[PDB]
Amino acid sequence: VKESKQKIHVGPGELDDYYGFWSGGHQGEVRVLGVPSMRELMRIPVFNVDSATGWGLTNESRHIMGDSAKFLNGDCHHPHISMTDGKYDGKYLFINDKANSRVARIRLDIMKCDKMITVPNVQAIHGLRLQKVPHTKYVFANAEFIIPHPNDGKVFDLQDENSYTMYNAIDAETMEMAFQVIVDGNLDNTDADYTGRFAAATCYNSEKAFDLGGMMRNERDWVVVFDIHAVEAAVKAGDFITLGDSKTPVLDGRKKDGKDSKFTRYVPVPKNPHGCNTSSDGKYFIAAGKLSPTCSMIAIDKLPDLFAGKLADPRDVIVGEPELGLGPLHTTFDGRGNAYTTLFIDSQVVKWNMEEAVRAYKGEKVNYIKQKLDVHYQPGHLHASLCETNEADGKWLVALSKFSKDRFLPVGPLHPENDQLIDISGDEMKLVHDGPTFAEPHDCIMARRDQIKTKKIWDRNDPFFAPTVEMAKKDGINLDTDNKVIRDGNKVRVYMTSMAPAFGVQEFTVKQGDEVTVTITNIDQIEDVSHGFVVVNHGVSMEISPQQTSSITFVADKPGLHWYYCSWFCHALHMEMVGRMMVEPA
Amino acid sequence: QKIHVGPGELDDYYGFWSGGHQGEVRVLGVPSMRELMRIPVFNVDSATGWGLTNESRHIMGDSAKFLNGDCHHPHISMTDGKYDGKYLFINDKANSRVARIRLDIMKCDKMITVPNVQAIHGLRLQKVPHTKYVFANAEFIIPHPNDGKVFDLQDENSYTMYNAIDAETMEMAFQVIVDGNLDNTDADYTGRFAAATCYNSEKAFDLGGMMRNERDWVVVFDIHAVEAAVKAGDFITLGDSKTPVLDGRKKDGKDSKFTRYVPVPKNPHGCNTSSDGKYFIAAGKLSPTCSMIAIDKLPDLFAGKLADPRDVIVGEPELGLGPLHTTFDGRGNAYTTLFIDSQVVKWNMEEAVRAYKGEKVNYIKQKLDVHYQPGHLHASLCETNEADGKWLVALSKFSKDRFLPVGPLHPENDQLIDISGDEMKLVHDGPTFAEPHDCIMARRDQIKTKKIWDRNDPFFAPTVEMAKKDGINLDTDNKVIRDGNKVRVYMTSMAPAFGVQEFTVKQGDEVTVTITNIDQIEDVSHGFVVVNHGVSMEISPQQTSSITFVADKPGLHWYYCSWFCHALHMEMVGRMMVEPAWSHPQ
């Protein structure tokens, strides 16, 4: 007998116990919450354009985004923290972009997106998870949609032999592509084991159809399992192809005339399975059945035998398939032997014992279902604290539901999502908080307070703005001290320091049509004294936090006097922290 | 007073938070302080497609080219000095705009760029007999014309103007040229008078210059006199704008018919009408005081019956360091933020008024420490004669240690204070992104929202007229219209299927996709994303939405529904097929 009775109120002056990193869904950002208060502490722009910080407007951010800076949107579902020996190391957060086919990396010491990649020769990055062991060497990412190769407009048929999608591995540290694996069917969600050898992904479109009925035709789709050791061996030996103008090694993981690839095995699983979740004891890949009212449990310790050809049937790695309820979508773990699964249709979270499900599969009469909790309403992902690590602590559970209906004040035709906090510390789940959120977070991830270490002020050598420091070097500029205007034909480069309540350059004059770059170094050393920079009626806006250098480029297309001001309230004389751009007529 | 809203309980008040330089409006429930909705206004919203869709860009006009805004001052329309819940208005200081939000659909439905001005900062609404005018301050002095010949702020044609917008039409009504500049503004409870603070009476551009005078002033506007001069045709126009412009400057020491200038120390900031209608209260900022202007003495001031503009001042209580803003409990007490001392001071207005007559009396009742450096503050219904004295939000600019570390950029701290009793009680610390400046609360029963769209809503009526030219009936048609190098796709949607699931175009075609969500069930919203084309929008039940993009890439391109709407949501998808340009003319 142990009861669920954790404190939920975080009063003035008290601090949260966990960080929560919420995906922003089709709003495109990442949100940092405090747990258990469920208050949003910070927003990290990633695929959105952020008016406040200038992400998407500044030269530093557009350099990280590359050519994809032309997009103003993203759709990000699956945030994950890098690991060392199967435990969070607090270094990086990665997330997908389903809308423009990207993966982004966030540095958790500065809480900024510091790298972004457009995955080549695919459409729509959905599923994303990280290698756990020995550490996060690879980010694994699913491309969801089957497309022609090449996609040059000659062939549109998804049944053609060169229409397919690929599993993607990105080098976590360099954020360059490592390899791609062609698969049969498509790819939904993915997870990795606790050794580094295996990863797995659900497939819902084994039919390679484009219509709803066609995509639901097969009694079973599959989870495809990847022998990452085998893939690495083939890349190391150089036997791969490349596609288009991308140098990424491409390996063929499709079945050929019934014959298995070295790189993959296809484990039949009902039906349009969705979630793909590694148990924290590392025993199971658990696929949520969605259209089937089940989960399927793949025994990871049978996968070597499967790939060695020792097993008569790929279904032999299935060791449990418990019946849970209508519309299972995702599963998480308390570290105590229980799994917790969302039932989208029944609108519940079901708590069940994994080892008892395995014994039921053998035909033992044993009830593995422990409890069903109503949630509100239609849950998608759920996440228990540290569930993606061998330190899963069984304390907090968030169920992220898609219809809030009557749970909050009405706010028009568009409704918030309902992310509900559930106490799982004891024998019974207890619903303790309804958290409304914008734009459909899909998944979230929690970390202990002590697993995240952040900078209080920027380092002057930070790679985030090192290209800008390089530009300054070519102009002979010492960013820490200089207040100067460089003139270069019709280009103008303003460099200034800033120190509340004054910009270091408070007026400058240019010619109508000049392309103006303004670089600002915040030389305040007091924590929290951020500055801003807005040029009135020019669409220019950006953050400069303590010891940061930030820069932005715009064309002075309007003759006359044009004011600029500090947007970050920074001092009693904030309103007076202004300057003038004077534009001489053409 | 209930502080906590548990699962299944609803908040008692709506809160409408400004987003500051993040550019949106945020809808909170009070007292839980949870964010229920985001309403994009000057920001580009990836989730709903605000700034990408044709409906939103139509409302933004040419200013749709800007991806940023800086909004500070949200206010709710009134009838006879009470909220009527029809509209919310807000400023854009970055690109000189005013936006209107329709509170039944919680969307921005109108936007205006204020002509011949730079930086719309202060904004407030006429109270009586209703909100006929939106009053808005242009903060920065500029030359007229601003054509690059003259830059001097001391030129006789360099000035700023006070701005009145017709609330219902969202067209300019008039502009009043003023001496000095403009900061914040409020209106009386008769409709005759508005008032604004000025901090740059010096017409300087440097910090020392702007602080030189011991007093600036609050300028008072006789709206009756302005309206009468407009009716009589007694006005000019500036540049290409037909807005009536009136001259409220002093000339050679003689007052305008339209304005009186009340000397007030010192770089004063907040300008707040007491809920009993007695006072304009200006916060002294650099002077440790507030100055109370007796509204019932203004008739005598404009009739030349007073010896000295100071004679309308009837109190100037000393409150503490850095008074910024004042609000009201409706019980005769005022509450003022002290930015420097980092407190809210509660004081009794009538006792301050007799202390100004020399009657020694302690008008200060309590000082509450806030965390840290408060800017605006807001008591529930403070802007109406229904000011109820229950809740107070102080919106602070430095959160320092009050929340978990999240890197060099910190959240703001908006603190909920119980003022229902004699003693202010700090109950909740609410972290927020991007610097909310002001917020406004409304009782739950003052806001009436629509659960699904009306098919004749003006928000998308232009789109309906477009469809009519094509013979479309949006409620039923699934058609692809071709028109040269334009393609107009019209479809219905109903979970989990798009009404048009594939279409074919030529490379280079300009494609418009119009979607009408014909689901009738509340909260069943759909989305639309074209992979790798930067296209994303919301379509909520009974809404029509449209978006335009170029099919610049040959081949098959998937589109999908971004709003989780159904168990088969992963499968609500379609295909755009783009025929290569080398197979088509040119």
Ligand code: CUZ
């Ligand atoms: Cu993209 S899917 Cu269950 Cu993760 Cu939401």
Ligand code: CUZ
């Ligand atoms: Cu724009 S100022 Cu006190 Cu309102 Cu923040």
Ligand code: CUA
């Ligand atoms: Cu710098 Cu406010």
Ligand code: CUA
């Ligand atoms: Cu329509 Cu999900």
Ligand SMILES: [Ca+2]
């Ligand atoms: Ca299938």
Ligand SMILES: [Ca+2]
């Ligand atoms: Ca002054």
Ligand SMILES: [Cl-]
């Ligand atoms: Cl998953």
Ligand SMILES: [Cl-]
């Ligand atoms: Cl238990």
Ligand SMILES: [Cl-]
């Ligand atoms: Cl104010």
Ligand SMILES: [K+]
């Ligand atoms: K939703």
Ligand SMILES: [K+]
């Ligand atoms: K701040």
Ligand code: NA
């Ligand atoms: Na990159």
Ligand code: NA
């Ligand atoms: Na307009």
